[PDB]
Scaffold this motif. Structure first.
Motif, short mmCIF file in Angstrom:
data_model
loop_
_atom_site.label_atom_id
_atom_site.label_comp_id
_atom_site.label_asym_id
_atom_site.label_seq_id
_atom_site.Cartn_x
_atom_site.Cartn_y
_atom_site.Cartn_z
N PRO A 64 0.65 -1.53 -0.27
CA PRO A 64 0.37 0.08 -0.27
C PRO A 64 0.44 1.07 0.12
CG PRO A 64 -1.37 -1.61 1.74
CD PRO A 64 0.64 -2.00 1.22
N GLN A 65 2.10 1.28 1.03
CA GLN A 65 3.20 2.67 0.64
C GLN A 65 2.98 3.02 -0.38
N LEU A 68 0.63 4.13 -3.15
CA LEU A 68 0.07 5.47 -3.54
C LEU A 68 1.29 6.55 -3.15
CD1 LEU A 68 -1.62 5.48 0.58
CD2 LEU A 68 -2.96 6.26 -1.60
N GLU A 69 2.85 6.27 -3.30
CA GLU A 69 3.55 6.12 -3.75
C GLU A 69 3.61 6.88 -5.04
OE1 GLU A 69 6.47 4.20 -2.05
OE2 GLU A 69 6.81 5.86 -0.15
N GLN A 72 -0.04 9.00 -6.00
CA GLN A 72 0.93 10.30 -5.93
C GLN A 72 1.62 10.38 -7.08
N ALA A 101 -6.33 7.77 -4.69
CA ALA A 101 -5.25 7.88 -3.67
C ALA A 101 -5.70 8.87 -2.55
CB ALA A 101 -4.22 8.47 -3.84
N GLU A 102 -7.12 9.51 -1.70
CA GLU A 102 -7.55 9.88 -1.12
C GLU A 102 -8.19 9.16 -0.24
N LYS A 105 -6.63 6.22 1.42
CA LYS A 105 -5.75 5.68 2.26
C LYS A 105 -6.84 6.49 2.68
N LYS A 106 -8.02 7.09 3.07
CA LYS A 106 -9.27 7.43 3.59
C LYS A 106 -9.48 5.92 4.63
N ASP A 109 -6.88 3.64 6.27
CA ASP A 109 -7.10 4.39 7.58
C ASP A 109 -8.44 3.49 8.39
N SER A 165 -15.53 8.24 -1.70
CA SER A 165 -14.58 8.87 -0.37
C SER A 165 -15.88 8.71 0.40
CB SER A 165 -14.60 10.20 -1.25
OG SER A 165 -13.59 11.45 0.16
#
Length: 212
Positions: A64-65, A68-69, A72, A101-102, A105-106, A109, A165
């Motif tokens: 996952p890291q 997202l990288e 971005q 991406a947002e 990430k949401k 999390d 989202s």
């Protein structure tokens, strides 16, 4: 700049090497390196091609890291490419990626905070499906910016990113709701159909692995 095709062949070796590695630091370096070239290049087609490599890479990264990288970086180069070419779709794609991406990430999390909430599990799935739709839609936007197919699939994929989202927002409020799980899953199927419809539209090269 030995040759435009040569550098293109170079990044592919870096992209394929990024997928093979199991260490997060090395992958982050590949993205930064791939981002540097496009950031310094004045060749929009070279930038455009590098983004395509980054789109496919985000699709295949299993950390996952690292994903997202990758998302971005795609957002960054897509925004630069839009300013250079003055092309709006490149901006549209850049916004959709950032939206995708947002939501990822949401949702990721949230699920960490409520690992047993099926509604939270459903929200992450929607965010993943929405992201894939954006990736395929950006690929069409870059290849066929004038096509109406790219216009429709970017608008839909962008739509799925906003829903993704919103799903993460409701899930956090109602982590225990079966109805919320069902709605999210219903929205997840629609986003998955968008991805499949858009994927069928793209044309791939009639160049088998053995020939190249």
């Amino acid at each position: 700049a030995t040759d435009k095709e040569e550098v293109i062949e170079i990044v592919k070796e870096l992209a394929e090497l990024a997928k093979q590695s199991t260490d997060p630091n090395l992958v982050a370096e590949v993205v930064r390196a791939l981002t540097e070239v496009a950031k310094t290049s004045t060749d929009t087609e070279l930038i455009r091609e590098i983004i395509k490599v980054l789109l496919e890479l985000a699709s295949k990264l299993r950390d996952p890291q690292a994903v997202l990288e990758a998302l971005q970086a795609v957002a960054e180069l897509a925004r630069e490419l839009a300013e250079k070419t003055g092309d709006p779709i490149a901006k549209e794609c850049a916004e959709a990626v950032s939206a995708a991406a947002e939501a990822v990430k949401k949702a990721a999390d949230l699920l960490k905070r409520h690992p047993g909430s099926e509604a939270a599990q459903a929200a992450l799935e929607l965010a993943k499906a929405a992201a894939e739709a954006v990736l395929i839609a950006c690929l069409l936007a870059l290849d066929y910016p004038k096509s109406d197919i790219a216009k429709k699939c970017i608008k839909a994929a962008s739509e799925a990113a906003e829903e993704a989202s919103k799903a993460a927002e409701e899930a956090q409020r109602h982590p225990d709701s079966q109805k919320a799980r069902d709605e999210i899953k219903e929205a997840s199927q629609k986003a998955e159909e968008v991805k499949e419809r858009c994927e069928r539209a793209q044309e791939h090269p009639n160049a088998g692995w053995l020939e190249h």
